[PDB]
Amino acid sequence: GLRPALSTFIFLLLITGGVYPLLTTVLGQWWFPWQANGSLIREGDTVRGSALIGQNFTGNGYFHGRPSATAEMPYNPQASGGSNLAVSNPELDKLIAARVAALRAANPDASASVPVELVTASASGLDNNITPQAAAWQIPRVAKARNLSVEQLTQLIAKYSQQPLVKYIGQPVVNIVELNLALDKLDE
Amino acid sequence: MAAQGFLLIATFLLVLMVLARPLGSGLARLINDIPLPGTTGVERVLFRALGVSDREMNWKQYLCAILGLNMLGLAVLFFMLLGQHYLPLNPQQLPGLSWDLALNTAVSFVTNTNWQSYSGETTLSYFSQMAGLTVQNFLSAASGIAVIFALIRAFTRQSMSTLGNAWVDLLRITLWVLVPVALLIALFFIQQGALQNFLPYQAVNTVEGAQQLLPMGPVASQEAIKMLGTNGGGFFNANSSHPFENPTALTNFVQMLAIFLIPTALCFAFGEVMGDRRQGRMLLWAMSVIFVICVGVVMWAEVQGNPHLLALGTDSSINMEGKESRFGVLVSSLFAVVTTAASCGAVIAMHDSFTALGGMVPMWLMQIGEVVFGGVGSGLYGMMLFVLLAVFIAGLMIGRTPEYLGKKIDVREMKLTALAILVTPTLVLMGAALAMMTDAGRSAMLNPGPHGFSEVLYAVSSAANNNGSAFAGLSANSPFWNCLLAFCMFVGRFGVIIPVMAIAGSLVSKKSQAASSGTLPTHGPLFVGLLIGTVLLVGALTFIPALALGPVAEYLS
Amino acid sequence: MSAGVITGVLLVFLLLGYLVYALINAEAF
Amino acid sequence: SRKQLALFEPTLVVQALKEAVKKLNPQAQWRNPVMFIVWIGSLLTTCISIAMASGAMPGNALFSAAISGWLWITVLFANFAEALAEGRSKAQANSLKGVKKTAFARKLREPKYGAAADKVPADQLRKGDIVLVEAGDIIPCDGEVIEGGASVDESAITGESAPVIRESGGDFASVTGGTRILSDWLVIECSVNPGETFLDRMIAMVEGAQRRKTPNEIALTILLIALTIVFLLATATLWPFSAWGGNAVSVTVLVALLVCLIPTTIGGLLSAIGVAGMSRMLGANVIATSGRAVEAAGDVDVLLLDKTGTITLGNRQASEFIPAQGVDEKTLADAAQLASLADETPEGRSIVILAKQRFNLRERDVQSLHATFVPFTAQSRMSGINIDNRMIRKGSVDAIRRHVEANGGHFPTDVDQKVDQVARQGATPLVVVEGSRVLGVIALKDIVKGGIKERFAQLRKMGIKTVMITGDNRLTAAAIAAEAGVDDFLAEATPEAKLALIRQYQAEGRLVAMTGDGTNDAPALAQADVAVAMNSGTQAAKEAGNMVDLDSNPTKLIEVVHIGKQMLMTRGSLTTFSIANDVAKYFAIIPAAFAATYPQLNALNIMCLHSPDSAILSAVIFNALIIVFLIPLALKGVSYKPLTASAMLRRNLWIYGLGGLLVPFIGIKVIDLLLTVCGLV
Ligand SMILES: CCCCCCCC/C=C/CCCCCCCC(=O)OC[C@H](COP(=O)(O)OCCN)OC(=O)CCCCCCCCCCCCCCC
Ligand SMILES: Nc1ncnc2c1ncn2[C@@H]1O[C@H](COP(=O)(O)OP(=O)(O)O)[C@@H](O)[C@H]1O
Ligand SMILES: [K+]
Ligand SMILES: [K+]
Ligand SMILES: [Mg+2]
Ligand SMILES: [Mg+2]
Numbered sequence A: 001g002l003r004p005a006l007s008t009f010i011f012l013l014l015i016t017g018g019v020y021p022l023l024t025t026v027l028g029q030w031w032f033p034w035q036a037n038g039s040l041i042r043e044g045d046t047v048r049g050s051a052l053i054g055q056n057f058t059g060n061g062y063f064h065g066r067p068s069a070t071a072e073m074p075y076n077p078q079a080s081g082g083s084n085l086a087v088s089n090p091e092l093d094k095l096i097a098a099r100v101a102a103l104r105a106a107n108p109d110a111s112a113s114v115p116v117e118l119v120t121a122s123a124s125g126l127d128n129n130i131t132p133q134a135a136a137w138q139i140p141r142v143a144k145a146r147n148l149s150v151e152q153l154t155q156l157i158a159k160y161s162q163q164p165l166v167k168y169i170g171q172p173v174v175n176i177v178e179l180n181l182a183l184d185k186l187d188e
Numbered sequence B: 001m002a003a004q005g006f007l008l009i010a011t012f013l014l015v016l017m018v019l020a021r022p023l024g025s026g027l028a029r030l031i032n033d034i035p036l037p038g039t040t041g042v043e044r045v046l047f048r049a050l051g052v053s054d055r056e057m058n059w060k061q062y063l064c065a066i067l068g069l070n071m072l073g074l075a076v077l078f079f080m081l082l083g084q085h086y087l088p089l090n091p092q093q094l095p096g097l098s099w100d101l102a103l104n105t106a107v108s109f110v111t112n113t114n115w116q117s118y119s120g121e122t123t124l125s126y127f128s129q130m131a132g133l134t135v136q137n138f139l140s141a142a143s144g145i146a147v148i149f150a151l152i153r154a155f156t157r158q159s160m161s162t163l164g165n166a167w168v169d170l171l172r173i174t175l176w177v178l179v180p181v182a183l184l185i186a187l188f189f190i191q192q193g194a195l196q197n198f199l200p201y202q203a204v205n206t207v208e209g210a211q212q213l214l215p216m217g218p219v220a221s222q223e224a225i226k227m228l229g230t231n232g233g234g235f236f237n238a239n240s241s242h243p244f245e246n247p248t249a250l251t252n253f254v255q256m257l258a259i260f261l262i263p264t265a266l267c268f269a270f271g272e273v274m275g276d277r278r279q280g281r282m283l284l285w286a287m288s289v290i291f292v293i294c295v296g297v298v299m300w301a302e303v304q305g306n307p308h309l310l311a312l313g314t315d316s317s318i319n320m321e322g323k324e325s326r327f328g329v330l331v332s333s334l335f336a337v338v339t340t341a342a343s344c345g346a347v348i349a350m351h352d353s354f355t356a357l358g359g360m361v362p363m364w365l366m367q368i369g370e371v372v373f374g375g376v377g378s379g380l381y382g383m384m385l386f387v388l389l390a391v392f393i394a395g396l397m398i399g400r401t402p403e404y405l406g407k408k409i410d411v412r413e414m415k416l417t418a419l420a421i422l423v424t425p426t427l428v429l430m431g432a433a434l435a436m437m438t439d440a441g442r443s444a445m446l447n448p449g450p451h452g453f454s455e456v457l458y459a460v461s462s463a464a465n466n467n468g469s470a471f472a473g474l475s476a477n478s479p480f481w482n483c484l485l486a487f488c489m490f491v492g493r494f495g496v497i498i499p500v501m502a503i504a505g506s507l508v509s510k511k512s513q514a515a516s517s518g519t520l521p522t523h524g525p526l527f528v529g530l531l532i533g534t535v536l537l538v539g540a541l542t543f544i545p546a547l548a549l550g551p552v553a554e555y556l557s
Numbered sequence C: 001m002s003a004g005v006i007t008g009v010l011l012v013f014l015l016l017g018y019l020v021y022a023l024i025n026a027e028a029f
Numbered sequence D: 001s002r003k004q005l006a007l008f009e010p011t012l013v014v015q016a017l018k019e020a021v022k023k024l025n026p027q028a029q030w031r032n033p034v035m036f037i038v039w040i041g042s043l044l045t046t047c048i049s050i051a052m053a054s055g056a057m058p059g060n061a062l063f064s065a066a067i068s069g070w071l072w073i074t075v076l077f078a079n080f081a082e083a084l085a086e087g088r089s090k091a092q093a094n095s096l097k098g099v100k101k102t103a104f105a106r107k108l109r110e111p112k113y114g115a116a117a118d119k120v121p122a123d124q125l126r127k128g129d130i131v132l133v134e135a136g137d138i139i140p141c142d143g144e145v146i147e148g149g150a151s152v153d154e155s156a157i158t159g160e161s162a163p164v165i166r167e168s169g170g171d172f173a174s175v176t177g178g179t180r181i182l183s184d185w186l187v188i189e190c191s192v193n194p195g196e197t198f199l200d201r202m203i204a205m206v207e208g209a210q211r212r213k214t215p216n217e218i219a220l221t222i223l224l225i226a227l228t229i230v231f232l233l234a235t236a237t238l239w240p241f242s243a244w245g246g247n248a249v250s251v252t253v254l255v256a257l258l259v260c261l262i263p264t265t266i267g268g269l270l271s272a273i274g275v276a277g278m279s280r281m282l283g284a285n286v287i288a289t290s291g292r293a294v295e296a297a298g299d300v301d302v303l304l305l306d307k308t309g310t311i312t313l314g315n316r317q318a319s320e321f322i323p324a325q326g327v328d329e330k331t332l333a334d335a336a337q338l339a340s341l342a343d344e345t346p347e348g349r350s351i352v353i354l355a356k357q358r359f360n361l362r363e364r365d366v367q368s369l370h371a372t373f374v375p376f377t378a379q380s381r382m383s384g385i386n387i388d389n390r391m392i393r394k395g396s397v398d399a400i401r402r403h404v405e406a407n408g409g410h411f412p413t414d415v416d417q418k419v420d421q422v423a424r425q426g427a428t429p430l431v432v433v434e435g436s437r438v439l440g441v442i443a444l445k446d447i448v449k450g451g452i453k454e455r456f457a458q459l460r461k462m463g464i465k466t467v468m469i470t471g472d473n474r475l476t477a478a479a480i481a482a483e484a485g486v487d488d489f490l491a492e493a494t495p496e497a498k499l500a501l502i503r504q505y506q507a508e509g510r511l512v513a514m515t516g517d518g519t520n521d522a523p524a525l526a527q528a529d530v531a532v533a534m535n536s537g538t539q540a541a542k543e544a545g546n547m548v549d550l551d552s553n554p555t556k557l558i559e560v561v562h563i564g565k566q567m568l569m570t571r572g573s574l575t576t577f578s579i580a581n582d583v584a585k586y587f588a589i590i591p592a593a594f595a596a597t598y599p600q601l602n603a604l605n606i607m608c609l610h611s612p613d614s615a616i617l618s619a620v621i622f623n624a625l626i627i628v629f630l631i632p633l634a635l636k637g638v639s640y641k642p643l644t645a646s647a648m649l650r651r652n653l654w655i656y657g658l659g660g661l662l663v664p665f666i667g668i669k670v671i672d673l674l675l676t677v678c679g680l681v
Helices: A001-029 A088-105 A132-137 A137-148 A150-158 A175-187 B001-030 B040-048 B059-081 B099-110 B125-156 B165-193 B219-228 B249-273 B276-305 B308-312 B328-341 B356-367 B378-397 B413-437 B441-442 B449-465 B477-510 B525-556 C004-026 D010-022 D034-056 D061-097 D198-206 D215-236 D238-244 D251-261 D265-283 D291-298 D307-311 D331-341 D346-358 D397-407 D414-423 D452-462 D473-483 D496-509 D519-525 D538-542 D557-580 D582-593 D601-606 D612-629 D631-636 D644-676
Strands: A040-043 A046-050 A171-176 B202-205 B211-214 D105-108 D118-122 D130-134 D145-146 D149-153 D164-167 D185-190 D286-288 D301-308 D317-323 D372-374 D383-386 D390-397 D428-434 D437-445 D465-469 D488-490 D511-516 D530-534 D547-549
Touching: A001 A088, A001 B059, A001 B125, A001 B165, A001 B219, A001 B249, A001 D291, A040 A175, A046 A175, A046 B202, A046 D149, A046 D397, A088 B308, A132 A137, A132 A150, A132 A171, A137 A150, A137 A175, A150 A175, A171 A175, B001 B125, B001 B165, B001 B249, B001 B276, B001 B328, B001 B525, B001 D631, B040 B165, B059 B125, B059 B165, B059 B477, B099 B125, B099 B477, B125 B165, B125 B249, B125 B378, B125 B477, B165 B219, B165 B249, B165 D145, B165 D307, B165 D631, B202 B249, B211 D185, B219 B249, B249 B276, B249 B328, B249 B378, B249 D488, B276 B328, B276 B356, B276 B378, B276 B525, B328 B356, B356 B449, B356 B525, B378 B413, B378 B525, B378 D215, B378 D557, B378 D644, B413 B441, B413 B449, B413 B525, B413 D215, B413 D238, B413 D301, B441 B477, B449 B477, B449 B525, B525 D215, B525 D238, B525 D557, B525 D582, B525 D601, C004 D215, D010 D061, D034 D061, D034 D215, D034 D251, D034 D265, D061 D198, D061 D251, D061 D265, D061 D465, D061 D612, D061 D631, D105 D557, D149 D185, D164 D372, D185 D286, D198 D265, D198 D286, D198 D582, D215 D238, D215 D557, D238 D251, D251 D538, D251 D582, D251 D612, D265 D286, D265 D291, D265 D557, D265 D612, D265 D631, D286 D291, D291 D530, D291 D557, D301 D496, D301 D557, D307 D465, D307 D473, D307 D511, D317 D331, D317 D346, D331 D346, D331 D383, D331 D437, D383 D397, D383 D644, D390 D397, D397 D428, D397 D437, D397 D644, D414 D473, D428 D473, D437 D452, D452 D465, D452 D557, D465 D473, D465 D496, D473 D488, D511 D519, D519 D538, D530 D557, D582 D601, D582 D612, D582 D644, D612 D631
Parallel strands: D301 D465, D301 D511, D465 D488, D511 D530, D530 D547
Antiparallel strands: A040 A046, B202 B211, D105 D118, D105 D130, D130 D185, D145 D185, D149 D164, D286 D547, D317 D437, D372 D383, D383 D390, D390 D428, D428 D437
């Protein structure tokens, strides 16, 4: 009974490990080359990032995303993960208070009630998305830094805002990297 | 908020039932040894080439075939991880894994657990992910579905000593069900933004001027079988929260459907094979009622979230910590229940950052034996163990011999059912206790207080139940944790399969008795409530003391 | 390890073994 | 037999407490794994309390001695229920050994009545010994009557003083020792050596020295052991779990928690349900070989009943001599007498007796005619005398017609009409033929037992189909089936056909209940799963069948179904009650156990118990007291009602499922309040 056991395992290993992925790769690269290669954003000959991977924005003229609890530096794709901090852990309260104070000082013309997503780290540390209301909270800081009005920033946020097919399977989000990249072209 | 949550649950269940019914009919053909249309010609040539003659085998031979194939896969995967540096498709010269990490990873994927104490982007090569992990994602899932095929055949066969051919079942399940469905799911994932390539890591010059290195690899092909087979092993450390693995909410909705697709279709196939669709609907009703309540509690708990957020200066108290913006709190709550009621283990949110009550329900769902839709095949025969207890108690309370589907339940079945039910809780309590009495186990905690104990309890419960999800704050990449969880995963998987196969062997030789006037029906609200009560009461009473010292203490503090 | 922990582990192990043996041979029990 | 004593006789309650103390030995407790854990925990807490009293170990010695004392009460209460059931069982067994043996056996040198008898004590009698008895004496040993016929009083065994008829050559030949012969005399040939008497069958029924566990009890024990294993793991691992969050939970509390969690209520009462159910069989005048056959009566769907001897009283007496055309009544009696001169069957004797008053014929004897006799046989269905030249035969209509056709001749038209007429009311027609000439028919009147119609209605409501199997004529069987209330019948059934019917019913997987009285039913009684033999039948049927009914009631299966289902229902209901009792135990002990390690857990003290020490004590006290409070339920059993399966389960889940969730909450609260009032806590 050794021949059926060896032949079934070897054949299934070849199909699932050398035929199924090869067919998926060939069909994926033929039909959706851009998404299969990382949805890279390119200007000239240099890759500026991926449309799905968030970046660490710290300037005053840039929209800021959610905190990233990556190992070495914030928004590190080589170490993806969350903070895994419990509700009862006092270290989480210390981090939130620091983020609330930092956001409050950097946004003196906004409401004192900071949006919750801007003080909480994501589950992956590479979140490129914030809600439109979270992005609109940063408008007065970005508008003054970039010498823009509220009307143009709301239209630019809406241009880079995506919504799901139905309202209960997902949240409306804003592509931070794409919005910030377009913010550089508008200033140019 | 409540209306949005109700609509999300109703839409998920309605779409799942629509898709699972046609799949149940296809699975019924495989159970009845009827080849799918258009595959008769290919099967005849392939079976002869592989030396499979469709010879009927008893439960001992059927179990040995499953055990032999799993052991062969365990050895191949273990040595593949060790000699990974000598294998191709390694753009980053990652060295071979250590003995404890390789052993834990090889056992984890063979046992359909996919517990991961590493980060894939800096640990495993493309060859290891593709030829080592994805292969076991297909094989481990097919092994579980093959076992439930034998158990279902035992009920529907009269005075027979054989339960079909295991090699034929494994080939038919993988080639005609797992592979084609995963291919369609993977292609849909690629269109939405999932990775499918073999390029080296890509350097990124960010807008601010920092450096980002983007990992690559055939993510989408692994992702589809990871979801469909209730495997849960993520390509990257972030698992399903990673944008490269689950880019959009559309892919997330499909991921949840793929988790419950085969387990739901098996219940539909169970009714069709037995000739009474009410039996299959009874199992779904008991599973759905528990599942629906569990989602609502987690959704409610996460909506309240952190009470300190409002005082610290936020506009809302919703627990967005360890959650993705594109999914939201409600979707994250539903995924946590789906991935823990089932044996998938994939996470779109960090369960360690969940609220005390929000994380207790997923932990308790694993602890009850993974019977709320369970894993692929494992959930059905896991629920069959509780069904046998339910008919035994119901038969006694009506003064009749215990019976299910016309087959008498004897002492031998109760002996095996009791042993099978006792396997997983024994490992959870003994394994968690051993960690708490050792410095190595205790030092792995990240959070203090009762939540710290919850990290240890969650890890052992997930490994013993072959779930794979984790309170990721725990540092399990140690020889003690790698060996302890490997033992729990191995015993928790094959220690239930052996008694279940013995149950099928004893039941197949019996002859079903026609229902009389006094026969107790096994369908309807009364039996659904009894089955739900049997599952909940047994599961709760076992783990109340452990949960009291963990999430319950955290919630009340 | 404390001397009370050791004597508390064997006692549980003996009781579990006795109950497991009783379950396997429930006809005699 | 059938005279109940009490539930708590003072003579046996005090004797049950003495046996419960001697059941504390570890050898006795080793065979009950659930109660052995409580026994081990009681010793562990006793030793711990001794160490605290001596100062070797810090803690509260009084609290440990209070938990240990009630733990010893729990094992004593479980052994008291078992002793009470066994004590009541041996009381019935002692009542039967009390039957007087005359020891005055008049053994006969030769079988014929009238020989010299030598004084021999009863104990020396063995198989094959002929013993002569006279009116007013006691039958020495069980045997088959070989000659003579007289009334017998069986009030010693059956408990009823109504006389029965015992005579040789028929189904009334079987007799049992200890009964009192009433009227004339009998000549009994002993059939069983001492040690195999029917009385010994009844004793071994309730003695219960080494009781054999039924498969249902074994299957229930597996689940009870599995629950004990899972609760032992969930309690032992609690110590390292609590040791990390603060001070470890005390061993005494953990032992108290384990006892309250393990199914002590059903485990301590399981050995008392089986003995009590077997004792209720004796009170119903049913002698069952084993409890396994009793539990099989809860699944029977069809009941097979014999006509003559079981449904009817038997002893068919001829009523009128209906002659054929061209034959006078005087000629009919002469042929009838010849075929019944040596016929010892009850029908044969009635034929001879009825002819005497009608026509005072001279009493011919068999040796005077120098002829042989054909004995009646179930297969042949005919009997007669083959005298010189002339041939006289009688038997069933079908048997006679087939014999007549083979020899030659045709049944007269009037005779066929007469057969139908006498079979319409219920009398069995006997056709007597002289050579190849039909002489007439004889009507044998029979008496149907009273009250059988309503009892059969109860069986119909219970989902049990009643079928009357008999070898008699079809026309008379229908008039008896409609006079008894059975569902269907099967007439002209040979003894090999009744066995085939049972196998045919068993082929589909159903359970067949068969009751019979005659000797030809012995093969069909050993095949049915549930077999009940009348006490007025033969000894072969009594041993072949599973159970023996002392009241000779054809509808005695109703009582067997009651107790058989009661034992299963009591085990299931108590098991559900015990498991559901753990919910309140968790709400009473868990907040108390970790009152210092986790003060926030006190929010789960929904019962608002006074003290953490009083909370644990109240749970332990309730755990012990619930066993004693459910003793009458275990002895009497869960009440049976003729409901559907989905309605019986619903009612049992409402009384013991929901009731088991709520009773401990009230019980623990009341005990805690009483302790606070008395100042103990
Ligand atoms: C939690 C502790 C135990 C708790 C016990 C609580 C008892 C609750 C009982 C309620 C019944 C009252 C009826 C009142 C009227 C109801 C009207 C109605 O619509 O009822 C619809 C159906 C009728 O179904 P049917 O058409 O008659 O039957 C045809 C279908 N078989 O009842 C239902 O759904 C009722 C569902 C009841 C579920 C009970 C679960 C018991 C669990 C026991 C666990 C045992 C563990 C053993 C472990 C070894
Ligand atoms: N002593 C007898 N002599 C001749 N025929 C008899 C005698 N006793 C019974 N029979 C007839 O033989 C047939 C078979 O009887 P049996 O199978 O014993 O039926 P039952 O059990 O109702 O007596 C009956 O129909 C009856 O009429
Ligand atoms: K898994
Ligand atoms: K108890
Ligand atoms: Mg007869
Ligand atoms: Mg008869």
